[PDB]
Amino acid sequence: MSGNTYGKLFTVTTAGESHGPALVAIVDGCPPGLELSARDLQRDLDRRKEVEILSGVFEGKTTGTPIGLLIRNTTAMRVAAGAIAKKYLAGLGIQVRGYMSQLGPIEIPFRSWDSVEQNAFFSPDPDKVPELEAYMDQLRRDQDSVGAKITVVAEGVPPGLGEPIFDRLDAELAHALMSINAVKGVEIGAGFASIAQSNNAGGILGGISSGQPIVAHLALKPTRATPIAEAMMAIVLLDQLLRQRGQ
């Protein structure tokens, strides 16, 4: 339907049904000078386990003009847009990465970033992968599904990001992350855990970034969510970052 645009400065507008002729996006605020090509978008799309750049780049670098994306169709656009934001944010030394914290009753503890890209579950502990595989098989046998907890983390973000009262950084992240269909809950920092009363502000104080790492936890309802969560986090961070230069 008609809520097909997101962002203020760094803006994504999108169109297409998954069964129709194509998906199309226009990404609107990307600063000039970024080395960008269809394979940069391909790498992010594949992590989820065909993108044509129609405009907004000249000899392999971004001009400042709107970028048209086209996907031929023989979550796509959200991820492809986010790949542009990640690639830009990388240039400022900002890294947005996600992992699975929980698959149903199996709490998975964090052991390394590197381990995340080595398994199908985005599990940061490779010793839990056998258990996670066997649990999934059990679900596959019973035909029923179950929720998960995704954790998305942005490192190197400077302090100052966020625009109170209504467009607080935690609030804009909540919007973008909760827009994912599976996501029924969002936490910045410790959140609902330790209602009872590194860092548990989760990088955000009074809706402005600390300079600390920004940490969001996502709750996924019973029906590949990590890449689309990272994409949304990157889009919001880039959008807020560009609204900063303006001051």
Q: Which residues of this protein are in contact with its own copies, per CB under 8 A?
A: 1-6, 12, 14, 78, 102, 104-105, 144-149, 162-168, 170-179, 181, 183-197, 201-202, 206-207, 217, 219-222
Min dist CB 96 to its own copies, Å, is: 18
> By the 8 A CB rule, do 34 and 24 touch?
no
Closest to its own copies by CB, 72 or 184: 184
Min dist CB 168 to its own copies, Å, is: 5
Min dist CB 149 to its own copies, Å, is: 5
Closest to its own copies by CB, 44 or 239: 239
Closest to its own copies by CB, 89 or 232: 232
Place of tokens 């970024």: 34
Tokens of 99: 């992992």
Closest to its own copies by CB, 4 or 37: 4
> By the 8 A CB rule, do 71 and 51 touch?
yes
Asked whether residue 20 is marked as a ligand-binding residue, the answer is: no
Q: How many other C-beta atoms are found inside a 10 Å radius of the C-beta of residue 234?
A: 29
Q: How many other C-beta atoms are found inside a 10 Å radius of the C-beta of residue 90?
A: 14
Which SS3 state, helix, strand or coil, does residue 29 take?
coil
Tokens of 169: 């950084």
Asked whether residue 193 is marked as a ligand-binding residue, the answer is: no
> By the 8 A CB rule, do 186 and 218 touch?
yes
CA 91 to chain centroid, in Å, comes to 17
Asked whether residue 222 is marked as a ligand-binding residue, the answer is: yes
Asked whether residue 65 is marked as a ligand-binding residue, the answer is: no
Q: Which residues line the annotated binding site for NADP(+)?
A: 48
Q: Which residues line the annotated binding site?
A: 48, 181-182, 206, 221-223
